Amino acid sequence: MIIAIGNDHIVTMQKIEISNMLKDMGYTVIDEGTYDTHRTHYPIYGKKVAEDVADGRADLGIVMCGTGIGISTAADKNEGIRAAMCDDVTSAVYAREQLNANVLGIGGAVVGVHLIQDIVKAYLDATYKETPENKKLIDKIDNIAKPNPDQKDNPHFFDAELEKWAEGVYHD
Amino acid sequence: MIIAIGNDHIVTMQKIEISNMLKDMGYTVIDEGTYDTHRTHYPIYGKKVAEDVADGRADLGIVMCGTGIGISTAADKNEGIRAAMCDDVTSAVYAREQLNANVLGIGGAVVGVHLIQDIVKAYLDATYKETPENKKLIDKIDNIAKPNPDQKDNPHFFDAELEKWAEGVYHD
Amino acid sequence: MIIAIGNDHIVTMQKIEISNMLKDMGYTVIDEGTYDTHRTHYPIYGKKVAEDVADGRADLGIVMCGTGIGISTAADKNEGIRAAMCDDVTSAVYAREQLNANVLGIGGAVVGVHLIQDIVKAYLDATYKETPENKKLIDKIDNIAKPNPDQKDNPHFFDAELEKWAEGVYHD
Amino acid sequence: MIIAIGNDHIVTMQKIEISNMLKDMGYTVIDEGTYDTHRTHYPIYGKKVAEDVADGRADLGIVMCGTGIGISTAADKNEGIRAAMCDDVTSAVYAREQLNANVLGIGGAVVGVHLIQDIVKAYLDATYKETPENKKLIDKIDNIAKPNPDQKDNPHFFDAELEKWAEGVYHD
Amino acid sequence: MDVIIGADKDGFAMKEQVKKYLEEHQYRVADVTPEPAEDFVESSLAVTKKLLNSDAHKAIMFDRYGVGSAMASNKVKGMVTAVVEEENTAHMTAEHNGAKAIAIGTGITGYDRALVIIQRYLDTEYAGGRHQIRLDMLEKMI
Amino acid sequence: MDVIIGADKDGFAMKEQVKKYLEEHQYRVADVTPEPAEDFVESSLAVTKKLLNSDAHKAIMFDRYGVGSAMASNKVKGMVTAVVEEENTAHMTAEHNGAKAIAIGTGITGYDRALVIIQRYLDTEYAGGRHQIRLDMLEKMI
Amino acid sequence: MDVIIGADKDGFAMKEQVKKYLEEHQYRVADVTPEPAEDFVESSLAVTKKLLNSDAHKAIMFDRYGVGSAMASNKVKGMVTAVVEEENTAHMTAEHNGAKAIAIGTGITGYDRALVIIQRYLDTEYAGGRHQIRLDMLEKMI
Amino acid sequence: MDVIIGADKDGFAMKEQVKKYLEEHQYRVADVTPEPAEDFVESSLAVTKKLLNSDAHKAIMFDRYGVGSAMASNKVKGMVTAVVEEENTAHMTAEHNGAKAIAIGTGITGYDRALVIIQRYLDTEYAGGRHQIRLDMLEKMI
Ligand SMILES: O=C(CO)[C@H](O)[C@H](O)[C@H](O)CO
Ligand SMILES: O=C(CO)[C@H](O)[C@H](O)[C@H](O)CO
Ligand SMILES: O=C(CO)[C@H](O)[C@H](O)[C@H](O)CO
Ligand SMILES: O=C(CO)[C@H](O)[C@H](O)[C@H](O)CO
Known part of the structure; x- marks a missing residue:
């Protein structure tokens, strides 16, 4: 099984601990979250x-x-x-x-x-148990948002905000 | 105010963070817990x-x-x-x-x-407020144990166990 | 300027510190090295x-x-x-x-x-200064190895070794 | 054998690593250096x-x-x-x-x-090999400073400087 | 200050308790589920609708596990809902995130802890500044 | 497996629910507080006495915050009580500590979570070995 | 034990001293640069050829900074050269890496330190085992 | 700028090289050991004396291992001598410490590295500020 993991700069160390555990457990990991602890955006x-x-x-x-x-x-x-x-x-x-x-x-x-570690292991060990009840809940959840093709698989989706950040638009 | 702090080897890093915080807050700290991460006893x-x-x-x-x-x-x-x-x-x-x-x-x-950090801050910021109800609970708690002069102020109290440990009696 | 950085699991923490520094200095970083501290191959x-x-x-x-x-x-x-x-x-x-x-x-x-940090800074701040002497040394070095198209831009180059590892061939 | 160790706040983590090693090696350790990473004085x-x-x-x-x-x-x-x-x-x-x-x-x-770790181990493993040559060097070294009874075994020796520090005398 | 609240059958009991608490503390409460909602999707969406369509910036969603109400309401463009089970997130999510609402699971969090969580959330304002870039990003998503 | 349970007025409700849960799962339950105890000192001590005298090695104390039942019962020589509010300590305290009992705060922990905590505690055996030195030290104290 | 040594003009002096040291300690030394090499590329490659053809598994290259002899010799397929300027790498590169040779920079490392580095390198055997995968990978490269 | 230098028999050679280097770079050098000192105790103390009794604040002591000259000169009240083997301490000891002198071991550090170390040391001024408390403490000791 393949687990994708991500994180912001505040918890890179905790992400590393989980990544290590997942690999020891036999999972293939795709680390996407930030790799260092330099200020970035979740x-x-x-x-x-x-x-x-x-x-x-x-x-x-x-x-x-x-x-x-x-x-x-x-x-x-x-x-x-x-x-x-x-x-x-x-x-x-x-x-x-x-x-x-x-x-x-x-x-x-x-x-x-x-x-x-316990939360991750319990989550992974658990299995979805479909029932007409939860299937209705899930379907309702999957239909709340309206699909935006401009966001889907678009790596430059946040470029606009990143540029403003580099320009000091979001100063404190 | 003086705060004494202690820990076992599993959480020395967390102890250090709290020690740093207490000092930044103006408290005087007496660090007793273990100073490194070498296996020891809580x-x-x-x-x-x-x-x-x-x-x-x-x-x-x-x-x-x-x-x-x-x-x-x-x-x-x-x-x-x-x-x-x-x-x-x-x-x-x-x-x-x-x-x-x-x-x-x-x-x-x-x-x-x-x-x-939040737990420590909240605990320290809190103030005991006596009431006929909790005064009675506190008195009960203070009188449950039977004082043992052999334990009181005796830093060698656990020496027998420490010796048994040094002799491999507590092997896994 | 773009700096690519990599590392094995023994020094991921040091890599993170250097990554942070490079970004603070204005460099764009491409982190390739391993992202966690799970045993891997340099x-x-x-x-x-x-x-x-x-x-x-x-x-x-x-x-x-x-x-x-x-x-x-x-x-x-x-x-x-x-x-x-x-x-x-x-x-x-x-x-x-x-x-x-x-x-x-x-x-x-x-x-x-x-x-x-000092080594990295000094290396980056330094500038190559061509001379008939080092140009000749550099040319010699660039022509020692025999190019192997099978290795060039082939990310699967070490797959055979990775498989042998997954099969316990490299046990201690 | 007993090894006393100390450090300032910049290298508390490295001190912990050495303390751990010394104990694994069978040495008794007296940790004096600072215990956390709060700014202090070497x-x-x-x-x-x-x-x-x-x-x-x-x-x-x-x-x-x-x-x-x-x-x-x-x-x-x-x-x-x-x-x-x-x-x-x-x-x-x-x-x-x-x-x-x-x-x-x-x-x-x-x-x-x-x-x-290598420096510490090599230093501890080494043994003083007296000769009339080094004994003369050592004696000269031991007689350079003039003993000050006010410093020897005086815990309040630096109180004067610490007070000034608390008073903000050493601001940047 | 105004507070929007809502709950499904599982969180209704605590919702009623908190409403009395809030009203006793001079809070103007808008209850969008006087009767328990069919499920957490209905209650969370009802709270979200009333929130985004009002001048209130604080809301509390009640259900059994919290996760559901947040999972559902966060699908709404512009909404930001935080599941809260401890006292640090209680204030941090408001300070850093838009925290338009918090979700409390009655099967997870005890009532006394819920009140501390709620009070911390209500007493904390958004810091803005650098955090806005992330909120701008979130609002841009579906 | 035997389980000793007890509670004061604030923990009684959950105690009753858990008792039903335990019976449904074939556990032999010894309830030392059929009626709520005067306070958590009385209930926690009642549980401690019954436990240290019984062959049971598992017990659950219920009160509003958990803290009190643990603070009071741990004053008893030989007793080891763990306040538990999350799922890791639920099993680790049994594995590492004597965990002769766990204390649950009904105002802190929701019912569904309490059941997971309880089952993890009941399903975990003490590991002994290196951990025994710490238990020997604790049992030596007042 | 056999040891192959070589040096350019900048590393010649130390090379001569080390040669004397090695002979005094019963090492069979093969000096590929009785006269200083034109540059470190010539000396490092001369050492590499002699080593990969000999039954020896230890070699020392001398130049002004070490960096060059390693940069050049590592271009040879199957070769593994370690620049060494401290006492930990001196043995770790032998234990973990193929360390077919070490490179010492005479303008960087003092003589007394170089001797300690050299002796630690010579006294350490390759550990094999898990490390072999990395060596197999390196030998596969150009 | 002025620089005080001195050396025993082991560090004399490099001392002579550095003197020529320094004089070539417009530095006014005060050599207290025109002839090699009996040992590092004599050379380091000679440099210290000339330093504390002059308007110069930079000095370089040369010997075989560096440790000796620092160990000896630091016994003098008010003196602060740093053994330097790498380029970070080269400047940091001047910035943070009084760094009245640095000690270089010729058997440890190569000449090219020594020059970089020396230049960094000479080009760095004491920062003062918070660091003064530590220097005040040191000067108070024997
Ligand atoms: O918890 C977070 C967002 O919910 C982030 O870790 C913090 O906002 C952090 O400051 C980075 O933005
Ligand atoms: O949580 C602990 C005791 O309750 C300790 O940290 C662990 O038992 C640890 O293994 C040291 O004994
Ligand atoms: O220094 C290394 C290779 O030269 C590596 O960090 C170590 O060999 C480590 O054990 C990983 O292989
Ligand atoms: O190296 C040090 C003193 O020589 C200290 O670590 C630094 O001065 C640090 O800033 C503490 O003063």
């Missing part, structure tokens, strides 16, 4: 992981940032994706078993590494 | 921190280990101590406000650094 | 960085492993590359000024981060 | 390690800071001490064998951990 990596999963390059995805909210929200906002923001094992298992979530989000700065 | 440091607090060398104490359970329990098993095991802000504030807990325990491997 | 990343430089995708390259010997040697064994193994500032400047070295190798486990 | 820890060695609480000492110059110089400026600043195995062995140096200084930010 949506970039959330989108990359989402597309790997949606296009079939990866079976499932895992994304992390400080709280996980930002990057998991970015991953959710893509066609074919059901991203589950889970800082606990219980909801992560529910996400996989009932909502067939294909992207797991975790807060690398609020959850300790041992617990992150 | 009760040793839990006891050291507990006595700093009980003997008046420190106002409050903070102890951490992988889950916090071991070291916070060790700390609790000392005269004059009310140790609270809190991996969340809500129970930590309750511990200080209602139980006048003087030792805070946290799981450095299950709680992320940002949340650890 | 020739893979040395080759990737070497080709980025040889194919014009990057202006210069920097590769690191425990001692730097393995990855810098891997990088050197590619068309168009002159890789210099330098754990000091003096030889690094010489490498750039006299040999027009386009790939810098450093031992991330034997050189401290501050000195690594 | 002379404090250099002096503490020096006195452990001079008073017989430790057999040898190891001190580190960014370059090692500061803390090793502080260690040298104490009665009964011969501190050797060595970022290499060769001079460290010479220091022990010829000058019977009892305190080793290393730059934790300029020397990689693998090399630091």
Whole structure:
């Protein structure tokens, strides 16, 4: 199985720990998230992981940032994706078993590494158990957003924002 | 104010982060926990921190280990101590406000650094507020254990176990 | 300017520090080396960085492993590359000024981060200065190896070895 | 054998690595250097390690800071001490064998951990080999400074400077 | 300050408790699910609609696990919903993210903790600045 | 497998639910608080006494925050109680520590999560070995 | 043990000293540059040819910076040359890498240190095992 | 700028080379060991004396291993001598420490590297500020 993983600069170290674990477990990993700890933007990596999963390059995805909210929200906002923001094992298992979530989000700065490992393992070990009940829920979820061809598989999608960033438009 | 802190080898890095923060906040820190990451035993440091607090060398104490359970329990098993095991802000504030807990325990491997910082800050910022109800609970807790002069202020209390360890008695 | 960087699992943390620095300095970084600390093989990343430089995708390259010997040697064994193994500032400047070295190798486990930063800075700040003497040395070096089209731009070049590894052929 | 170790805040992580190694090697360690990474002053820890060695609480000492110059110089400026600043195995062995140096200084930010480990091991493994030649050198060295009873075993020796620091006298 | 709230059958109980809490603390509450919603998709979308179509910038969604309401509402262009189970994210998601709403799972988070989470969320304003680039990116997505 | 359970007024409701859960899963349950205890000190100590006297090696204490039941029961010589609010400690405290009991705070932990925590705790055996030194140290303390 | 040595004009002096050292310690030395080579490319390649053809598995190249002899000789298929300026790489490159030769820069490394580096290199055997995959990869390259 | 230099028998050769280098680069050099000193204790103390008793703030001590000259001269109250073997300390010791002198071991450091080290040291001024507390502490010691 192939797992795509991504992250922002705040949790690169936690991402490395999970990447190592996944490989020890026999999983093939596609690391998309940022590779160092230089200030960057979570949506970039959330989108990359989402597309790997949606296009079939990866079976499932895992994304992390400080709280996980930002990057998991970015991953959710893509066609074919059901991203589950889970800082606990219980909801992560529910996400996989009932909502067939294909992207797991975790807060690398609020959850300790041992617990992150447990959440990831539980999420991966879980299996979607279809029922007419959850199939209806899932279908409703898959039909909420309106597909935008300009976003789908478009690497230059955020260039506009990146340029403004280089121009100091987003100063503090 | 003086804060005593301790830890086992699993969470020395998290201890360092909290130590740094406490000093930046103006607290005087007495680091007792282990200083490196060489395999050691949580009760040793839990006891050291507990006595700093009980003997008046420190106002409050903070102890951490992988889950916090071991070291916070060790700390609790000392005269004059009310140790609270809190991996969340809500129970930590309750511990200080209602139980006048003087030792805070946290799981450095299950709680992320940002949340650890929040728990510590909330615990320290909180103030004990006496009430006929919690005064009665506190009195009960302070009288459960039977004092052992052989343990009180005895740093050699665990020597027998340390010797058995050096002799391979506790092999896996 | 574009800098390609790579590393094996022993020095991923040092690579991250250098990546951060290069970006703060205004360079565009292409991180090829391994992204986590899971056991892997230095020739893979040395080759990737070497080709980025040889194919014009990057202006210069920097590769690191425990001692730097393995990855810098891997990088050197590619068309168009002159890789210099330098754990000091003096030889690094010489490498750039006299040999027009386009790939810098450093031992991330034997050189401290501050000195690594100095070596990288000195190497980058240096400028090649042609002379009838070094032009002749450079020409000799560029003509020692016999080009192998099967290796050039072939990312599957080491697949046979990777398979033997997955099959336990390289056990200790 | 007992080894006293100390460090400033810049190299606490490297100190931890060495402390771990020393313990795995069977040495008893007295960690004096700073325990976290909060800004502090190298002379404090250099002096503490020096006195452990001079008073017989430790057999040898190891001190580190960014370059090692500061803390090793502080260690040298104490009665009964011969501190050797060595970022290499060769001079460290010479220091022990010829000058019977009892305190080793290393730059934790300029020397990689693998090399630091090698320097420490070589220094510890070496044995002083007395000759009328080096005995004369050593005696001359031991008689250069004039003993100051106000410094010897005086923990409040630097209080004056620390107060000024708290008062913002040493601002940048 | 205004707060939009909603819940499905699983989060209805806590939703009612929080409403009483909020009203007791001078908060003007807009309950879009006086009766429990069919499911978390309906409740979260109802809260989102009322939010994006109002002058309120704080909302709380209640369901069993939190994940569902966030997964659903985040599909709406411009919406940003944070599942919250601890006290750090409670304030950080508001400070850094648009945090238009937080989702609480009643099967995951106890009531006392929920109140601390809610109070922290309500008491925190968006910092803007550098964070806006990420919010601009999110709003650009479907 | 035997399991001792107890609770004060704040933890009674969940205690009752868990008791039903345990019975449904063939566990032999010893409830020391058929009626809610006066406070968590009474309930936690009642659980501790029953446990240290029984052949059971698993117990669950319920109160509002968990913290209290653990703080009080750990004062008993030989007792080891773990406050648990997440799924990693749920099993690690059993594996590494004596974990003679776990304490759950009903105002902190939701029911569904509590059940996962409880099952992980019950399914995990103490590993012994190197961990015994720490337990010997703890049992030596007051 | 056999050792192949060579040097250009800048590394000749040290090469001569080391040769004396090696002979004094019973090493069978093959000096490919009795007279200094025209440049480090000539000397490093001379050493490489003699080594890959001899039964010796240890060699030392001398030049002003080390960098050049390594850069040039590593272009030879199957060759592995390590520039060495400190005592850890001195043995680690032999243990992990093929380290068919080490390159010392006379303008970088002092004589006493060079001798320690050389002796550590000569006293260390290749560990094989997992390391062989990387060597197989290197020998495959041009 | 002025530079005080000195050396024992082992560092004399490089000392003479550096003196010519320095004089060629407009540096005013004060050589306190026109003839090699008896040993590094004599040469380092001679350099220290001339330094502390002059208006120069830069000095270079030459011997075989560097360690000796630093170990000896640092015993003098107020003196600060840094053994230097690499290019980072070369400038950092001047910036952060009083760096009244650097010690170079001719058996450890090659000449070309020595010149880079020396130039970096000479070109760097003390930063003062927060660093002064440490220098005040050192000068207070014997
Ligand atoms: O948690 C995050 C987004 O939800 C990020 O880690 C932080 O916003 C961080 O400051 C990067 O933007
Ligand atoms: O969490 C812990 C004790 O409760 C410790 O960190 C672990 O048991 C660790 O393995 C050291 O004993
Ligand atoms: O230095 C290295 C190769 O020269 C590598 O870092 C080590 O061999 C490491 O063990 C990985 O192979
Ligand atoms: O190398 C050091 C002193 O020689 C210290 O690490 C640095 O001066 C650091 O800035 C602390 O003062």
